[PDB]
């Protein structure tokens, strides 16, 4: 695609070809923890994903996703903000060049080492591209990646990327359990916004988890060796695939904790 991470086509371009870029409810967003309202009527989340299917991993050029068969209601989350049920399709990372930089969404200013989200689409539209056009129809779970203590779970998707390098590249990968990549406290900031790649839709429930889990220095330095490039094309590495924090505009970041 045209659009990407680079000084010349760069999130700061986007709004030529996506003009929802400068919208009203856009992510990813600064959460400011001191701002934030308390909402004592949230519900728990309810995470589902015992019966979780992976089929494949892939690099589209702007990251890499692990994808679900999400034909049934295997991997769902409900709960919390959410009405329904909203079943698990992808998840993928964004990351930075150095641990200081990568996280789309930021507390209280922190930019974290990396952000994974898990996308899922609200059953009640019948599939993904549906769901997209429809306010409610995304819910995405967003955890923080701080480097420390490496995270086992992680280990099997750093393992494959030496296979998916370059823009296009796939590979099998089933059995992968995504239960390794929560952390142990579910409590969560949430707010209407957007998808925060092209096309952008203004379509997204938000979950960000306040708790981080941790990964080792060298788990993300793998994820730093991928490439945004097709195979054989010029080497540019896979690095800062974030979006800056967008402005809050009319909106509520709500609390389920105090
Ligand atoms: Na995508
Ligand atoms: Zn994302």
Redesign the pocket.
């Known amino acids: 695609h045209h659009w990407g991470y680079g000084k010349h086509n760069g999130p700061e371009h986007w709004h030529k070809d996506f003009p929802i870029a400068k919208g009203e409810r856009q992510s990813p967003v600064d959460i400011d923890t001191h701002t934030a309202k308390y909402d004592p009527s949230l519900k728990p989340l309810s995470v589902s994903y015992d019966q979780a299917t992976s089929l494949r991993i892939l690099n589209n050029g702007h990251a890499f996703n692990v994808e679900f068969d999400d034909s049934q209601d295997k991997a769902v989350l409900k709960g919390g903000p959410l009405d329904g049920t909203y079943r698990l399709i992808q998840f ?1 990372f ?1 990351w930075g060049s150095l641990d200081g930089q990568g996280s789309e969404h930021t507390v209280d200013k922190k930019k974290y080492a990396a952000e994974l ?1 898990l996308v899922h689409w609200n059953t009640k539209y019948g599939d993904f591209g549906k769901a997209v056009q429809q306010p409610d129809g995304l819910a995405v779970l967003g955890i923080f990646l701080k480097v420390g203590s490496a995270k086992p779970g992680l280990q099997k998707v750093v393992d494959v990327l030496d296979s998916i390098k370059t823009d296009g590249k796939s590979a099998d990968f089933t059995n992968f359990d995504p239960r390794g990549l929560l952390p142990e406290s579910l409590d969560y900031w949430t707010y209407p916004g957007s998808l ?1 790649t092209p096309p952008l839709l203004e379509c997204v429930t938000w979950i960000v988890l306040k708790e981080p889990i941790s990964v080792s220095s060298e788990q993300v330095l793998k994820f730093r060796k991928l490439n945004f490039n097709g195979e054989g094309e010029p080497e540019e590495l896979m690095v800062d695939n974030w979006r800056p924090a967008q402005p809050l505009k009319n909106r509520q970041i709500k609390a389920s904790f105090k």
């Open positions: 993928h964004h989200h925060t």
